[PDB]
Amino acid sequence: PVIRKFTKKNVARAKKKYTPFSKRFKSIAAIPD
DNA sequence: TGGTTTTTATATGTTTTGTTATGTATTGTTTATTTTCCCTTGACTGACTGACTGACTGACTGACTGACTGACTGACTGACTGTATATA
């Protein structure tokens, strides 16, 4: 029923992440080398 | 435990509105010069109206005039009173 007011389909979205490394150890002691 | 949905970050697209610099044309600024009729300056012109010359008829003193009024005085008529006259 809805209509998008303007289309982007030839987009090529890149599979790249927004979570930095700062948020996959969660502590100073929690980090490997 | 385990699969699914909802929101968000990044990335891009869309549209409206407002900012700044500029080159060309119009018009203003200053200064010098000539013409136009409005506004001062003034004698001429025409009616005006103050002092001087005429004048005109009502007011108070000159009392006047003349009839009338007021005191005096004699004339006269009525009331008072004596001389007189008559009778017992």
UniProtKB/Swiss-Prot annotation:
Top-level division of the source organism's lineage: Eukaryota
Coiled-coil region list: none
Localization of this protein: Nucleus
Described purpose of this protein according to its UniProt entry: Component of the origin recognition complex (ORC) that binds origins of replication. It has a role in both chromosomal replication and mating type transcriptional silencing. Binds to the ARS consensus sequence (ACS) of origins of replication.
Free-text comment on this protein's domains from its UniProt entry: The N-terminus is dedicated to mating-type repression.
Membership in a protein family: Belongs to the ORC1 family.
Summary of subunit composition and partner proteins: Component of the origin recognition complex (ORC) composed of at least ORC1, ORC2, ORC3, ORC4, ORC5 and ORC6. Interacts with MCM10 and TAH11.
General remark: Present with 3930 molecules/cell in log phase SD medium.
Designated name of the protein: Origin recognition complex subunit 1
Source organism of this protein record: Saccharomyces cerevisiae (strain ATCC 204508 / S288c) (Baker's yeast)
Gene field: ORC1
